[PDB]
Design a protein around this ligand. Sequence first.
Ligand SMILES: *C(=O)C1CCNc2c(NC(=O)CCC(=O)O)cc3cc(O)c(O)cc3[n+]21
Lengths: 8, 687
Amino acid sequence: XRXKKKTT
Amino acid sequence: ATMITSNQLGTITEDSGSYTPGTIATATRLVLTPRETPQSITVVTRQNMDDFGLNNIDDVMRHTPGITVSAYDTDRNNYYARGFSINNFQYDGIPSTARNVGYSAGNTLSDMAIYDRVEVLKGATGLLTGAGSLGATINLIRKKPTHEFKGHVELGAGSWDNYRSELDVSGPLTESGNVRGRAVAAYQDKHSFMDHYERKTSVYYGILEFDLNPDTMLTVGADYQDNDPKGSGWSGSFPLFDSQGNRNDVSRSFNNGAKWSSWEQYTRTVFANLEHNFANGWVGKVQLDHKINGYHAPLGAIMGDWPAPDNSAKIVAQKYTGETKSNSLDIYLTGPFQFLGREHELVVGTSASFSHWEGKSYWNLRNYDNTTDDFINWDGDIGKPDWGTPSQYIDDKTRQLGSYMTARFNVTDDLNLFLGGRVVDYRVTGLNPTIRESGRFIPYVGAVYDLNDTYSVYASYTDIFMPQDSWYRDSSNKLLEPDEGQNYEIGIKGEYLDGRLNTSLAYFEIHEENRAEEDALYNSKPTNPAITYAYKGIKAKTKGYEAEISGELAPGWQVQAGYTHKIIRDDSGKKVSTWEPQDQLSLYTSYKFKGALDKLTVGGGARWQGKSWQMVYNNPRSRWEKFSQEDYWLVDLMARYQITDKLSASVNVNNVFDKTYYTNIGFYTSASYGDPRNLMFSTRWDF
Ligand SMILES: *C(=O)C1CCNc2c(NC(=O)CCC(=O)O)cc3cc(O)c(O)cc3[n+]21
């Protein structure tokens, strides 16, 4: 989910 | 007089040291006993929170029956309610818009030191709260000032340098009493078994009332809690897989967190409201509300198949800051309605809410080395990199409206009908693909039939929906219609002794529509903007039963316990929510002694949940893996001695057997252990 962006 | 220890929200609990509740209007905004309430309900009274030292709310959800407490990261837990995740909080009957937990702030932790009870409404809350989530709606209730004087100050220290202390003071401020006031504040600083985690919170709150007779109380006040954690880990407690190696083993106290990583969440709020007593035998309440949920999160943690062969692991760092204000107008009229035969009641009411969430996120770090000397044995110590320029801004404002009207007809002095609904419109005018919904109808229909003077039966069709986020879009580029659902319920309740003891078991079945599932095949994503990534909307079904007792089990014997069998799957599909045990047993009880040593009370409880599993992904070998949490039998004892007419002495030991267990296993491929054997001494008021 919710939207965004831990490693990617 | 007419013994008014109750009120609009319903009879209070800071008195009747009975774990069972009195009257909850949390359902139809119409005061009703549980039996007179046709929806599944479970509530934690105050004399309960007290006995077991359930300080913050988490410490309540863990002890609430029917709910499962799962974790994300040190400062973030999720509550499982009937196959779904609870995500609707209602303060003094007012909902909240701190909806998104990715940028969580305040909800998952509220020091109870100020509420009289937290009433959780299982099923489909849509009637009162607007857009929301399937499962249940939590509902804290603040301490309202006391007519005659009363107050106290509690100290207390638990394990891992856990120290806390509150102070409650209430009463009249003028001979007559035309004006009553209450003020309470608490302080708590504790570390944790986990290394370097040492969070400290503080809460102040002041509430007052202004009489004038039917010109009933223009009550007002404001509260404010501040959680400043430090050493906060993120997503799990440690990565499930090493470099490529199989599983990772590590102390119950490892912490992917950064010594300096922390997730400061804070919430302050102001309310005002006057109720009016009309002569027709009717009353109408009007309330204003200004609340704010900010979040200061400069996270730093080690994540991702990292214990690498050369014993060293990189770590993601990211900072999130944000505050989110909201105004709320809620007015309602509720009283006797004569149609024919006998008097019934209606509760016409409309509400309005203007929120505004704006915030930043920093992950475009600059001049940084996120590698670490060695993995194993590490006190999350790395530099607090310099967050560059905000890498994603946020400016959204939601304007949810809606009006409602509920009917409590009775064809017979036993069978009563519940006709009513809540229409609504949602508007989230922000910085992204503006979306709104309007004129959607949320219906409320149920009825209770009085069998014997004891037991009784009910059935219900509760509903609720939720305009989805813009992230979710389908093959084309449309945000899958709102995630909706209805709770099909049928059960029998039963009370004994004016309402000292109360039982109930029912059958609930939930049907989910347009559940947001990640589209699969779609990797070979064709051009269109929805390109990159898109989800689809498939149906889900949740069916199960629940049973729980609560009240005066004997003379001074309090007991509240429950069991719940749940199962949830998607259109001829698999088992979703595999982590929320299909079966769970909760039992908590306290007994005061007779004569001999009637100056001593003893209590304890136990929880049980069947096998829990998750479906991770072993990137390093691409092979998918299963993970199961064997069994769960958790026990905790407690004891308290009233050494002086005014001054208590008690002690709770929360995990008797110290059961080495897992709280989360499939989160971004992480895991977090479980509070090993807790211990906390306390002392009551006076001097
Ligand atoms: C998406 O990336 C996800 C993964 C699944 N859901 C989820 C949740 N929790 C939910 O709302 C669903 C309940 C559950 O099973 O967990 C929370 C968060 C929070 C953050 O910060 C991020 O990045 C993702 C996330 N997801």
